[PDB]
Structures are given as structure tokens and as C-alpha cells.
């Protein structure tokens, strides 16, 4: 499977690190990689990966990007989510987005749409929401929306 990773508003220095270290990882794994950078914008496309690889690389890109722990937690949360949904449907379209407010997960799986949005939330909470979403899908629900805001 092929995967795209995107960063907005990294410093030049940080983006350079991401590029360099994504390259290294990929060539160590013998896989094709496309990196695109404009002002404020970095995008990485890797093409035929075992999921486990993909999720490793994404994690290291984030480290290389010098993101703080709150961002890193959400990255790990996103890791768990991507996995669990792929376990349900290997052909699900999964878009996970992280920013300074929180995290948002969009899944399209056959004719099933799932949207999960979180602000100021623990990684644990996200997992639990994902498992619940999957329960609903498993019981035949077509659409599941979840929204959570820490207090």
C-alpha cells in the first residue's frame, strides 16, 4: 500500500530534517519515495509499503520534524487509528489530520463513512472512540460521527 504524509508550517530546518531522514529510512527499506516542498508545505508519498513500515516512517518524520510531545501523542493516536481501521477494511480511505487544537479522523469504507473529531483529548480517549466506531460498523451502521472535547 501507498501513503502520503503532509506537514504545514514547519521551519526550513525542520523540513530539511524530515526530508533527509525519510530518504534514509526509505532507501534502507528499498522503496520508492517522492518528496515535494513549497513555502510552508512539505509532502511525502511512499508507494508500496507494509503498513508497519509506513507507520514507523510517519513516526520518525514526526520526530525529525521536532514536534513537541502533545503533537507526538496525537501522532501515536493516529498510528493506532490507521491500523485498526485497516484491520477492518484494508481498502478503506483514511485521512487523519492533526493540529494544535486536536485531531480529526475520516474513514470511507465501502459505503460506510466515519468521522471522529477531538479537541484537547488524551490518546487513550481516541483509541476508545475508534473501537466504538468499529463496533458500530461491525453491527452494520453506515455512518458514525464522534466529537469529543476535553474540559
Amino acid at each position: 500500500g501507498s501513503v502520503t504524509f503532509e506537514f504545514e508550517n514547519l521551519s526550513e530546518e525542520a523540513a530539511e530534517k524530515v526530508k533527509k531522514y525519510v530518504k534514509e529510512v526509505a532507501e534502507k527499506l528499498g522503496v520508492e519515495v517522492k518528496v515535494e516542498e513549497e513555502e510552508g508545505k512539505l509532502k511525502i508519498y511512499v508507494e508500496n509499503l507494509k503498513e508497519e513500515d509506513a507507520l514507523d516512517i510517519f513516526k520518525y518524520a514526526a520526530l525529525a520534524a521536532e514536534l513537541d510531545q502533545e503533537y507526538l501523542d496525537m501522532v501515536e493516536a493516529a498510528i493506532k487509528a490507521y491500523h485498526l481501521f485497516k484491520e477492518y477494511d484494508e481498502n478503506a480511505t483514511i485521512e487523519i489530520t492533526i493540529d494544535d487544537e486536536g485531531i480529526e479522523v475520516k474513514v470511507e469504507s465501502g459505503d460506510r463513512v466515519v468521522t471522529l473529531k477531538f479537541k484537547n483529548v488524551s490518546k487513550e480517549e481516541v483509541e476508545e472512540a475508534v473501537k466504538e466506531a468499529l463496533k458500530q460498523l461491525e453491527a452494520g451502521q453506515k455512518k458514525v460521527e464522534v466529537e469529543v472535547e476535553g474540559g
Partner: peptide, 8 residues
Amino acid sequence: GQRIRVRI
């Protein structure tokens, strides 16, 4: 403010 995204 940073945004990160993983797709596909």
C-alpha cells in the same frame, strides 16, 4: 501553527 496529515 503546525498541521500534520497521513492519508490513504
